[PDB]
Amino acid sequence: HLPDLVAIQRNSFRWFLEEGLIEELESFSPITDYTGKLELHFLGKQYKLKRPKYDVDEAKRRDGTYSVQMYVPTRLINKETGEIKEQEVFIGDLPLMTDRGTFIINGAERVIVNQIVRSPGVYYKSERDKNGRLTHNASLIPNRGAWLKFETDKNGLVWVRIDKTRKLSAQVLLKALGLSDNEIYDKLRHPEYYQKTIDKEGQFSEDEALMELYRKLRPGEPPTVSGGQQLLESRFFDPKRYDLGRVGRYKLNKKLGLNVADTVRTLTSEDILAAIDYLINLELDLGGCEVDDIDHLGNRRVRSVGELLQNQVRVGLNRLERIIRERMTVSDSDSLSPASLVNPKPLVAAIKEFFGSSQLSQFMDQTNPLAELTHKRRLSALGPGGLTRERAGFAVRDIHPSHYGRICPIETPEGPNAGLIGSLATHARVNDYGFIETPFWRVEEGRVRKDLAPVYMTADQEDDLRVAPGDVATDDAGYILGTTIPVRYRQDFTTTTPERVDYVALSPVQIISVATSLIPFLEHDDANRALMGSNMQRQAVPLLRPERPLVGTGLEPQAARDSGMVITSPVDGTISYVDATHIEVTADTGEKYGYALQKYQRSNQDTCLNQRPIVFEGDRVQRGQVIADGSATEKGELALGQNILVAYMPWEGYNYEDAILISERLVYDDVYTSIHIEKFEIEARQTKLGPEEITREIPNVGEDALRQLDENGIIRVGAWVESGDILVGKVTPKGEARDVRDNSLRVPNGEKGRVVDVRLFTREQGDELPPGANMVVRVYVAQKRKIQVGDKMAGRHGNKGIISRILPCEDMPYLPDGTPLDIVLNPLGVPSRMNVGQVFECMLGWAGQLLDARFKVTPFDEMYGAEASRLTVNAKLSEAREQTGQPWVFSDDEPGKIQVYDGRTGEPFDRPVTVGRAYMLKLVHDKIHARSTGPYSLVTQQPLGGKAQQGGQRFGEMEVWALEAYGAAYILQELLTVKSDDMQGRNEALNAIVKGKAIPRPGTPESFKVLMRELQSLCLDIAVYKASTEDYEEDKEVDLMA
């Protein structure tokens, strides 16, 4: 029943376009100047949108932005003359969301992450003193504005703490609001508890209430009744400085039991009085009151691109209104038109900053369709309005019993981000208030009603019901089998009779995410290794020829149709034209449909985004049939790895501690080979001496290194570039003909491949070049990488490894039919890591190879039998043995093990080993780095860090401690001075090494001198001294800086 997987990103932009921008335009529409003579009205319900310029593909290839222009009709009304100059004003450029849920910013694909925050409303908490009683406090939190904290003291006093200032009894706040004693006495249910506070703090009247409120809020100024009134109005009553939100109003009404309208979004007297009454009742234990949990998913909200955009637009609109008022009052003449009145710079700047430089808009993860899909379904607890890494602690990063079916309990990062970034579950969705829901089937008298439609439900809703998991087994029609059924009641796990079950989850995979739903035999794995496998499935690399798994899980065809790289025919007809770049299908009786395929493009992670056709010319095609496929799909469905022959046994030390031994067939059969495209850039700037020229007249170079340039100084498409090869030839006008200097762009060390695209952008051609540049040349270089020693290989069950040896196929162990293996894995890593599912898939994959079949096993498949996975695997293996005719395929004494021989000697190993077909993936990432001498830092004169600039390795203080414990003094002193920042000892050491002499003694490193200068610059007279040798002499200050 899986709906659109990337719908949290669409619904929020469809909402922004439909009723999100309108509400923010109308909320600021009536602009009036101070004299009250001119008024600008923004008829924001009629904002039209101009069609996007360029195109999606043109924007991508030009390195531009995919956006539209917003025009709102306005009317400037003169309060007296009455002349109304109606017009349409330009408001801004809005980047548009593509059909896949992403945005195209500066020619790069970006995605707006979803933020899990605390929902607006009122939250109660009870705190216990070291020796005192329980004291209760309440926090009122709006969508945007100031917080309102209430607190109960140990003596029975009620205090209010506006913002973070000092407390003030609630009587001041209630009287300042304009409430007499009778109304606040009647609304409260237990009035003597507040009467104690009234008596202790004295009954304030409205005038003195406002006086004291002003005095406490803004000390040092003379109190003024009007001053206080205005302070309160600006703090909690100003529609443009305090917003509860629709969700805030909903939560306030739901919690406090009020009935206020949904349109009012500011605090009202009723609200504060109710909140106080609830606090009093919670203090007195009335019965219908309860403290709040802040980690509950019923008290937490999700914000997506629509809300975050709305907020940025609001800020820009506030700035725009300030500019409009400034450029409206100054004018002494009504010669202004609405076009000349509005300035779209603040709004454009706000939108640009949000989409380019915010920490909620993120560079897309595009290694494969799975990473892309799970990047759009990601929920973050960090950002402008959430948490910070140093403030998030143990409680926040854990699993809350309310995450069941809404947030995956497996898929998270490892390290500082563990528990702070999560993934939406498979069936979960976000409603229009911002709370995550999840679907259930109704159960009537123990019968599951799959005829009726799924009932979605939020975390707070499903607390009074008894909800059964999706792995419960029902008989014909719908009745639940068994006598005891596990259920969840009030965030607890219990068991009940199946006549008292209220709801049942829709699927057994309703609790996990999409990446974790792609792991077969998941219930036989540990959760840590399941996390590892799910995370590593999103680092797999699209291969040269992808291949479907044999033991897939059933969600592969659905995890690939949302990335928008598979083409399916919407029409039940015939195919008339097939090409490497074009497909055409003629409807049985109708129009022709034509599709264009992307070819060897480049993703954010330098992988390849190819697209290939599947069908042939003159082929009968049905609707919904796969027509083209992506770089990580075979025929409809995800394909991230390959199926290879695997044996579980140790080699001669090459399997040691997660190392991997593979065969040479994986190299010459083009298994686990991939295409990676990199981008290099060169800039022609304008120096004070003169401009920079791209030409082949490069100094100090021979014609043997200008073979592949295009008589303009730029390499040619289709040329093979090795390391250090010139890509674009550039000359700079240095100041000291023989005057040009060479800073042409060359391939970095360790890079090679073919040149596939050389795009040029110059201001003449109508391109948006940087401020000081006069030519931007971009070169794309592609290469094919094979599996090799040092690469990371992985499986779906969390088993990672680094390849340490590649054996010729006559050295690898072979089967009783002569087939050498493809990979040998150490079994020592299986039982200590509890990822037994890898031993099931292999075996089933073995059967799948032998029976020319493909198995779709769904996780948690043991609801049908006592041991369903083992029985299915054994039955499949026996069936394969009977169909093939070879008895060595399957043995009854050792089911999963068969005899294997040694390729080096021809002798069989002592005992049979487990062999099968395993689905392994090749992970991304270019890490090898070395340095002798290179660039140095500006202040400290220490080597730079980074592979791209010949950087050094850091010798931290733990390494200094390690060298101190060894007793090493000369290695340490050489590391600290001669090899880092002894500005004069570096050259002497290098010269001594080159000449062959001895390295001289070092001096004082430059960082110490920098520190002494900084300390002197802090008004400290710190200095270095040389002690006097004889008696009647003074110590002499030593000059280091010489």
Binding site: P935, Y936, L938, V939, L944, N987
Partner: peptide, 17 residues
């Protein structure tokens, strides 16, 4: 990560002396 840690220094590379 800061911008100031990605800028090289003016001087003669030990190699070029």
């Amino acid at each position: 990560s800061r911008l100031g840690d990605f800028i090289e220094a003016d001087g003669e590379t030990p190699e070029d002396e």
